[PDB]
Amino acid sequence: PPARPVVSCQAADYENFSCTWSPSQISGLPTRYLTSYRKKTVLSTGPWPCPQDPLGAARCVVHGAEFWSQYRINVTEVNPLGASTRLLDVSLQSILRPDPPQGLRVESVPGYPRRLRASWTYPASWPCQPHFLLKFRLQYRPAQHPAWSTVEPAGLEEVITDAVAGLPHAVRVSARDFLDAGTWSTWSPEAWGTPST
Amino acid sequence: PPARPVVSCQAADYENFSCTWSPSQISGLPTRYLTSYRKKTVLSTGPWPCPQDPLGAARCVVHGAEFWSQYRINVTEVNPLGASTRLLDVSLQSILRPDPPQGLRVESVPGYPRRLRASWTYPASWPCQPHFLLKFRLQYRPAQHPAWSTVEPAGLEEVITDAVAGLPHAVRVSARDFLDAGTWSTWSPEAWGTPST
Amino acid sequence: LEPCGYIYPEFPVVQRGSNFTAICVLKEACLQHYYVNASYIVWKTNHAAVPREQVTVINRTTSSVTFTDVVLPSVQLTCNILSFGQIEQNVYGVTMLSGFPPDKPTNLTCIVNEGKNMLCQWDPGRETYLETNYTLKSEWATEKFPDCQSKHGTSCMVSYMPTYYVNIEVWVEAENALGKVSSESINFDPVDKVKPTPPYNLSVTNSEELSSILKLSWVSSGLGGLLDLKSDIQYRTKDASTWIQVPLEDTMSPRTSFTVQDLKPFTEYVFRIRSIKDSGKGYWSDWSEEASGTTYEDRPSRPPSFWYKTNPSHGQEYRSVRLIWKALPLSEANGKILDYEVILTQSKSVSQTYTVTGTELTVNLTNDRYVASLAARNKVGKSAAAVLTIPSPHVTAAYSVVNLKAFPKDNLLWVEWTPPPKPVSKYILEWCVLSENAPCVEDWQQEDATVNRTHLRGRLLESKCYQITVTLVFATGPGGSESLKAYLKQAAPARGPTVRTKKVGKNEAVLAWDQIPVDDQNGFIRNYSISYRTSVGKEMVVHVDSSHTEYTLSSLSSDTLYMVRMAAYTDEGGKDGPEFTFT
Amino acid sequence: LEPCGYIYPEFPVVQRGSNFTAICVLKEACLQHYYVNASYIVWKTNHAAVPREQVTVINRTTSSVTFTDVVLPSVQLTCNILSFGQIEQNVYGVTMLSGFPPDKPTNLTCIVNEGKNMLCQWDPGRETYLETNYTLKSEWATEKFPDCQSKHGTSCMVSYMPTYYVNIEVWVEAENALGKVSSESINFDPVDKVKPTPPYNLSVTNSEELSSILKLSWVSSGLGGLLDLKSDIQYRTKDASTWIQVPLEDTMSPRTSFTVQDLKPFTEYVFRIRSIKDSGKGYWSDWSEEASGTTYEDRPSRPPSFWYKTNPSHGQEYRSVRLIWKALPLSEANGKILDYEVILTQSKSVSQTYTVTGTELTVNLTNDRYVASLAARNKVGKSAAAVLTIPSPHVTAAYSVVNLKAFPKDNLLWVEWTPPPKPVSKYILEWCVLSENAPCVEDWQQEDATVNRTHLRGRLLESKCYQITVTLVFATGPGGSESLKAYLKQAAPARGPTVRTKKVGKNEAVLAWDQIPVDDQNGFIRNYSISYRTSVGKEMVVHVDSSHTEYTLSSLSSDTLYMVRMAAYTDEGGKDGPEFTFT
Amino acid sequence: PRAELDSTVLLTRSLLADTRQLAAQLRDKFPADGDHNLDSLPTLAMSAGALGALQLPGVLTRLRADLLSYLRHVQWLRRAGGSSLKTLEPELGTLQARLDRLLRRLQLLMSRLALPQPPPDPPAPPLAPPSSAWGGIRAAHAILGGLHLTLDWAVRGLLLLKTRL
Amino acid sequence: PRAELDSTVLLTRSLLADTRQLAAQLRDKFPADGDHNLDSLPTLAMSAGALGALQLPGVLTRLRADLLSYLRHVQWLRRAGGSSLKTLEPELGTLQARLDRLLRRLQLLMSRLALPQPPPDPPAPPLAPPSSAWGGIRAAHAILGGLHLTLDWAVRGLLLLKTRL
Ligand SMILES: *[C@@H]1O[C@H](CO)[C@@H](O[C@@H]2O[C@H](CO)[C@@H](O)[C@H](O)[C@H]2NC(C)=O)[C@H](O)[C@H]1NC(C)=O
Ligand SMILES: *[C@@H]1O[C@H](CO)[C@@H](O[C@@H]2O[C@H](CO)[C@@H](O)[C@H](O)[C@H]2NC(C)=O)[C@H](O)[C@H]1NC(C)=O
Ligand SMILES: *[C@@H]1O[C@H](CO)[C@@H](O[C@@H]2O[C@H](CO)[C@@H](O)[C@H](O)[C@H]2NC(C)=O)[C@H](O)[C@H]1NC(C)=O
Ligand SMILES: *[C@@H]1O[C@H](CO)[C@@H](O[C@@H]2O[C@H](CO)[C@@H](O)[C@H](O)[C@H]2NC(C)=O)[C@H](O)[C@H]1NC(C)=O
Ligand SMILES: *[C@@H]1O[C@H](CO)[C@@H](O)[C@H](O)[C@H]1NC(C)=O
Ligand SMILES: *[C@@H]1O[C@H](CO)[C@@H](O)[C@H](O)[C@H]1NC(C)=O
Ligand SMILES: *[C@@H]1O[C@H](CO)[C@@H](O)[C@H](O)[C@H]1NC(C)=O
């Protein structure tokens, strides 16, 4: 019989999540994947076939997922050796992980040689509705000095008040749901900015 | 009119008390004293004529007085100028004052040059029934040194454990009802005793 | 027979300093039973009988006491009767109270110690002399909180949890028997009043890259980051008590770390911090504990003072050169001086290299000209190299200082000289105590080419003669060394001069004396006084300049015993020598 | 669908180190709903999954876990099922407790701190690892008192007032889930167990009549004298730490004052006291605070040391006699020395009297014989009178000490002499530092007639030469004064000798030297070594006894430069002098 | 029962002393002059010579009756006298609780003597509350003085008894 | 009412955070795995996109109903769950009292908005006590998780509202 397939789900946004799967070990035979999910309650809701990518890839997108609700995924390999089912419990509120913020810029502050202005934008994947704001966390350090100073700015802009005069500082940011749903995004790429004279 | 006569009462023992009186100022006329007492209650008991001394002295003895009870004395001078009454409230339990203890002796303690044995006897006026014991207080000091060390011995005998070797110590005693009724007697005369070699 | 009477009023609360009337009324039955009328009423303030302030005209059964300026706060006033005119019977008694109605409490202020109930305090006002139940009322738009009652009347800690984010209204109600008064209500959100606990686990780290920089870090409770807290950071050099303050505008936003800059390259610093709500509402926290850290060491900024000495080794192809240097001060070491590297270059030949941990290096150089080089190496790297051209012994110095002087000033032995017309590279000065019992133990210091006057940097001794030496150092090597003698400070000589006769004549005597040893001259000998007398004649005195070593007494009496005394004087006085006698 | 199952037993209390079996039984409905059988049960000790210690053969619906040596005191054991073989669903969980049943508490002891509730304490025994409600039960013949429950299990203070004079019975009941055990009941009257508070307002008074005696006094609470308290009194000289104890049998009865005797006549003492029930039941109180007092001063026991000195006043009818005495030590002053009374009796004439507060009196006596008298007066009275016959100047001393010696021992300069055949009244010894730059400043001490050897009582200096003088004092006056020289301790000379040639010959040279000044000789000069050498010859050495002042070098080479060095040696080594040269 | 007798003696002495202290305290903070008496208090009306002639039953009966009625009056004070009495607390309650302790001790002693156990006297009618705080203080004086005399008599009589046994 | 809205927001954020902490604490001292749900708890069953479309009456009605039923379940836990829950005290009672504070704040907000005041719903039937301490813990998990989600929804919806007003 086929081994239990490995299944993982991730949510880039507060309203869709995707699940991908692969075999533990290849059976070596023509193998179909039957994939389904159902809402979980106490003791509609029934199983819906998830829409597999028309490309035939091993992926489903659950469009319009219930945010405060648990879903049970049902990936079933079926082949002449008999079925093998992976069951996975998923809730967006926990699997959610925002994309990194985009367009990090660092600008010198005129007349403040010890200050830098950092600014960025919401990730395009996140429509940033006022009820689904992100909270951002920002790290800055001199180029060579590896220790990251960490701040948690409010909004898309922060003034670093202690930038070492004339040393290029690398800056990076991570995002989370403002209610601390899900988990912090991966850090953005580092951006370089030099304090003003 | 005659002024209010002065009256005072004293009790040598737990069962008799005596009262004596004298004029504030002599009227200068033949003056009789009418003297009476009555028991006090709430709102027999009536007035009894106290037995004046057959000598005609200004004294009455209330024989067999109630110990835990208040009496009101009524001394009345009567003469052609009209009567004048002194009323006095008396209770033995408070006016009682034992006579000084009699026969204070101080003896050297053989083989204890720093110790003296003091002994005395109940005053003869006090029949020392087991329910009417006295408590005695004793004072001792070297002849010339005026400061009195004070002790409250139990019973008729005390060993002074700190007598200065070879200095004559004066000793004196005072008595009170063992329940601290009444007041301490006057101190006995001083007795002289020399510690042993 | 019921209580003989009653006093009216029963519970008199008297406004302090006002008058008060009490009346005692006896029941007819008490009168006829005790055979008295109200004239026999006796008033006592506690034990103290009222000295017939009372008046009894009111009627047969009634007596009144009047008090003026009732001062005692609590008086057990009792109405007694002299029963039968003799036995004082108590009728009634009332605790006369006196005091003031409470002042309206002002300055009602509350503070929420982080993690504690809301504390509010007020000015009580004047002393009331009466028990006052100061009640801290509190409510908000839907409910009244439990009343907090002050034990001592100056503060109350409520029982209920601080109701953050709600506009409570609170006021103090003060009540006593004389009157009840309520403070102004204050309408406030307690959140604005919280005092944060000081930051904790304060820590510092240095930058190995950046000596000048220390990184502060701390943990702020922030009520679980409930409060965005800004902070005020002060720091000082460990020795300096004066707290420097970080520009307060730089800490205006929530942060856990701050990078202090422009610190001394190797110095220990002490830091402290306190925090407040970002908006600056409420009250600054207490200061944290102090934290300390050391700026990472740095390349030493200046080369050590470098000099050489040679013992005269005439007739040898090799000369023992004692190279000597003085350790860099911390402000120049900027770190742990690990070793000194000495490089010796024989002109064009291979340069010798030596590593020395001590402050001196003895090397048997040839009589050739050498170039010495000295650098100080710490953890980070070598300092700039001091350079010292060791001339060949036969090279005569071409130029020396001129107009060299030395003088004490400000308790310091200063030395001044005129620079040569040639460009000096550096000046080296050397000095030693002059002594007849001990050798010239030399000490030395380096001065920059621009220096033309300096004080001798050392533990110079008062009343000790120092020889001073100045040697110019050119690129070609040392110039000619001029020397002079000076004192840091003078004193009277330790011993006077010893007088001896060189010649005696019929009317003259040539006195002679040996100069006081320099170990005993505590200063510059300016002159000597010679005093001499006969057994009866007046003592004559002669002053002799210190340059002289002999003097001829003249016009002496023949066949006469003369006694001679001699004293030597400095700028600080002189010392008599032993008496001498001659015939 | 009810809870999928239940674990049996639910509240397992496991005797520590024993084995335990838990069983998890699933309801058929849970099985058929989740499509599992008991094989899918997964056991977790908190987070830690049990590594299949469990066995499931029991039946389709039942799984059992067996633990060996259950050690953790509290384990949240939970029964889970791998729903569909994938999703672990919790079924049930039980807090597995393990521990020991309580030890029976031993050493149940109670103490009644005066004015506090009865405190009782016990040994808890081994650690039980379980909460144990140690209950202090108490009762007497008619009623049971409120149960006191220990917070920490080692002591409980009951709430009820100590029920004096009643035999209470009390016991500790220890309870935990494993078992309940009761201590032995102790049957006791609390009154016997009271610890009295220490005495307070401790005070001391001295007897002006009786220096040797101090009177202690104290206030004892005695629960209002409820307890007849005896006391234990300790005292010490203020300097001595060792507490002396008053004979305990003397304080065996209730008292408030005790007369300490045989105290030093003028000395400060410290006292402390503690009290216990007269019967000695219960426990000694803590010590009082220390109290201090000074024995009243007394007549000084011994006359001061008395001596006289006269400057030679030849040719005057009057002689200035400097009478001098040394203050009595406290052990002899026994009090405040107010003044000294000096009486001078000119034989049969009227005796002069003087009162002097200083330690010296200068009086211009005639050349007649005088009798001096000295007494020390304190508050109480004059000491015995010292007597000192001042002889007339012409009276020659008839007898002096013989065989006088002095030697240092034990770092002390001792002096010994043979008594004269006549009865000495007292010995006076005098000494001064010998110096060439300063006068003989004398110091002195008195010795009794019986003393024939004594140490010099003074701050003698090492390496300093002292002249020593001994003068016998007879009733007729002082005898002849013998003198000698000695050192307390020696050292090498501060300077070596200075060598000078007296004569030089073809093969000889008479060296001469001046003895080192006594201010520079740090000891007895025993000998000198003379060393001399040519520019190339071997250095010869000659030893010369210190008595000599000159030596003739012999067998010298002619026409040869000789260098000479000379050193002087004490018992502690020697010092080289300056080198000298001659041809 | 001699240990019972000396124990009871010492307990009554302690109670006597405390009563004395409290009485003095009251007298000094609330000076009240002359006779304050309650008609409902028991009266001692026997000679010193009569005490010496009594026999165990009458002695112990009177003692119990007296002390018990005083316990009732004390409780009545503490409840009803109002504010003022707190000035004398905890001393009052201490008095009362030692007094009930002493009554238990006396009952036990009677049991040990195997005397006829005291009658079950029906409870006294409830004392009319004091007219006023002043009347309460008056009550305080009267009660405490009567208790003092009661305990003096008690002590002396119990000592007398002890010489019989 | 904007000061009412931001005040309510901040109070609900505080309550959310505390709830989170308590939930974590429980999860860590009483690890319990899988789904612990009570059928009597309210269910959130609306999309992220649907929240954005709601209108004040339905929003605030649901919020009040949800929070109030949770208040009932919390009280039921604290009374009935027995011993175990004290492990989480005072935190539970704090939760509850802030929750009743928040319900009052919401009622007042509804008054300020002059919306139709919520119906006087008759009280829910009393919750059957938990079968056992274990069932109590299970209840604890279910309740606290549902409260957490409830307050997340609450916060987000109130913020949505604020942009409308
Ligand atoms: C997961 O999905 C698989 C198929 O996608 C389900 O397996 C089917 O279950 C039904 C109902 O029991 C049977 O009639 C079919 O024959 C099964 N098909 C296969 C290929 O096994 C499975 O039951 C689902 N599991 C869950 C928990 O939903
Ligand atoms: C989540 O899935 C929904 C459902 O498909 C997406 O909504 C569509 O997004 C596409 C791509 O931008 C638009 O062209 C459509 O108009 C959207 N609506 C519909 C009904 O198809 C949505 O973009 C996905 N992502 C997010 C972040 O919501
Ligand atoms: C005190 O005693 C005197 C007489 O000893 C009493 O005075 C008598 O009182 C009665 C009754 O009132 C009268 O009939 C008499 O005429 C009175 N005699 C005199 C001489 O005055 C007096 O009443 C007594 N007082 C008390 C308080 O007992
Ligand atoms: C107290 O008074 C009584 C009554 O008089 C006295 O008792 C008499 O005392 C005398 C003198 O000693 C005896 O002769 C009598 O026998 C006693 N009894 C009677 C009935 O008279 C008693 O002495 C007085 N003093 C004391 C201390 O009791
Ligand atoms: C006495 O005077 C008082 C005070 O005015 C009054 O209350 C009382 O009634 C008067 N009594 C008589 C009998 O007039
Ligand atoms: C009270 O009585 C005395 C003496 O009997 C009398 O002088 C006085 O006038 C009386 N007072 C009144 C107010 O009746
Ligand atoms: C449980 O089910 C598995 C798989 O269906 C089976 O192998 C096993 O024997 C079953 N166990 C019992 C006890 O029935």
Side-chain angles (χ1 to χ4, degrees), chain D residues 44 47 76 78 80 88-93, chain F residues 28-29 31-36 132 134 138:
Chain D
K44 303 187 175 173
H47 316 93
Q76 303 56 47
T78 88
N80 314 329
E88 200 165 22
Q89 258 285 1
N90 176 263
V91 179
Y92 216 80
Chain F
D28 188 359
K29 297 215 291 301
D33 57 33
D35 307 359
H36 321 298
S132 57
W134 195 248
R138 300 263 289 198

Side-chain angles (χ1 to χ4, degrees), chain E residues 86-127:
Chain E
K86 292 187 181 179
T87 58
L88 316 177
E89 291 285 34
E91 294 68 7
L92 287 160
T94 316
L95 190 91
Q96 192 202 320
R98 290 177 173 161
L99 183 58
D100 80 38
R101 181 199 305 162
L102 175 56
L103 279 146
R104 283 189 295 290
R105 286 288 303 146
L106 289 165
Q107 179 57 16
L108 186 64
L109 186 75
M110 297 180 73
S111 92
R112 193 84 185 260
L113 271 294
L115 294 160
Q117 64 175 347
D121 185 38
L127 305 172

Side-chain angles (χ1 to χ4, degrees), chain C residues 3 10 44 46-47 76 78 80-81 87-94, chain E residues 27-36 131-135 137-138:
Chain C
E10 213 161 44
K44 303 187 175 173
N46 310 338
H47 316 93
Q76 303 56 47
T78 88
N80 314 329
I81 61 169
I87 310 151
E88 200 165 22
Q89 258 285 1
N90 176 263
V91 179
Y92 216 80
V94 297
Chain E
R27 201 183 305 296
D28 188 359
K29 297 215 291 301
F30 314 80
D33 57 33
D35 307 359
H36 321 298
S131 183
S132 57
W134 195 248
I137 309 148
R138 300 263 289 198

Side-chain angles (χ1 to χ4, degrees), chain C residues 338-354:
Chain C
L338 312 176
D339 69 80
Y340 309 92
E341 189 168 294
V342 181
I343 302 168
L344 279 147
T345 305
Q346 185 204 23
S347 300
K348 302 183 180 179
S349 306
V350 176
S351 305
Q352 302 183 5
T353 299
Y354 297 91

Side-chain angles (χ1 to χ4, degrees), chain A residues 4 72 85-87, chain D residues 1 33 84 86-87:
Chain A
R4 224 173 292 292
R72 179 162 292 156
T85 301
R86 176 66 73 182
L87 308 171
Chain D
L1 179 61
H33 179 67
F84 307 92
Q86 301 168 48
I87 310 151

